[PDB]
């Protein structure tokens, strides 16, 4: 009942959007829903590839797809082999020609999404979260992050009630608009319901 989205309110001064184009009022919904299925199917196609963010830049009558991953080879396949299979079907989904492009991140222990789905892979294979979420914290503290808070929630540990636990290490100034924060969410479906994970990673200034 508090704490509005970190990636929500920085979008005019710090972090850019994840879909940068302009379309008028007649085709604004048509552009938006097509973006929703190219984010759905691609994350479905590249679940294990450890993809963090996807940038969708449409210069009209075209779409530039960007994939930010920690596993470059699995994304591109074998020299672009899987990408041409996507090229036939990404253009089939959005109904427009697709110029697929690939980016990368060097440090997955500093990218919020990559930290979050790691605990998702941990907690769905029945491991103890107390040293699994401690693992992700001590990872980022020595990888260059100035501070990181990791939160897990749900009925973790097979308990009846929903025991919630959060843990931080270092600066995490959520209120400061000058403070860049990498934040993302992931959820884990065990047989004990859904366990959601939320992690904040603070880096610095403008």
């Amino acid at each position: 009942g508090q704490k509005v989205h970190p990636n929500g309110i920085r979008l005019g001064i710090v972090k850019p959007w994840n879909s940068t184009w302009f379309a008028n009022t007649k085709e604004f919904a048509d552009n938006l829903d097509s973006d929703f299925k190219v984010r759905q199917y691609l994350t479905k196609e590249l679940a294990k590839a450890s993809v963090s963010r996807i940038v969708i830049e449409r210069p009209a009558k075209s779409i530039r797809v960007t994939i930010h991953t920690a596993r470059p080879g699995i994304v591109i396949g074998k020299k672009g082999e899987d990408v041409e299979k996507l090229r036939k079907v990404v253009a089939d989904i959005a109904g427009v020609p697709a110029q697929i492009n690939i980016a990368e991140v060097r440090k997955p222990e500093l990218d919020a999404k990559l930290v979050a789905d790691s605990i998702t892979s941990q907690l769905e294979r029945r491991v103890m979260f107390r040293r699994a979420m401690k693992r992700a914290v001590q990872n980022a503290m020595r990888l260059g992050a100035k501070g990181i808070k990791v939160e897990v929630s749900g009925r973790l540990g097979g308990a009846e009630i929903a025991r919630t636990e959060w843990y931080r290490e270092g600066r995490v100034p959520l209120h400061t608009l000058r403070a860049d924060i990498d934040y993302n969410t992931s959820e884990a479906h065990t047989t004990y319901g859904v366990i959601g994970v939320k992690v904040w990673i603070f880096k610095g200034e403008i």
Binding site: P59, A60, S62
Partner: protein
């Protein structure tokens, strides 16, 4: 003769004069009184609504 240029709204046309030559587009608006057709060209993706004369463009 080759003088095809008549284009109503939503009709595709052809440009063969000026930098827009060798390009096709549709006439969203027409102006018979001003003798000018409002057609945009798909230049670098974004439609480039430009006014071309009937002889400046050909009917598609």
């Amino acid at each position: 003769p080759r003088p095809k240029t008549l284009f109503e709204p939503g009709e595709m046309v052809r440009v063969n004069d000026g930098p827009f030559a060798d390009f096709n587009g549709v006439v969203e608006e027409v102006d018979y009184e001003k003798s000018r057709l409002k057609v945009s060209v798909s230049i670098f993706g974004r439609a480039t609504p430009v006014e071309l004369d009937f002889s400046q463009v050909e009917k598609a």
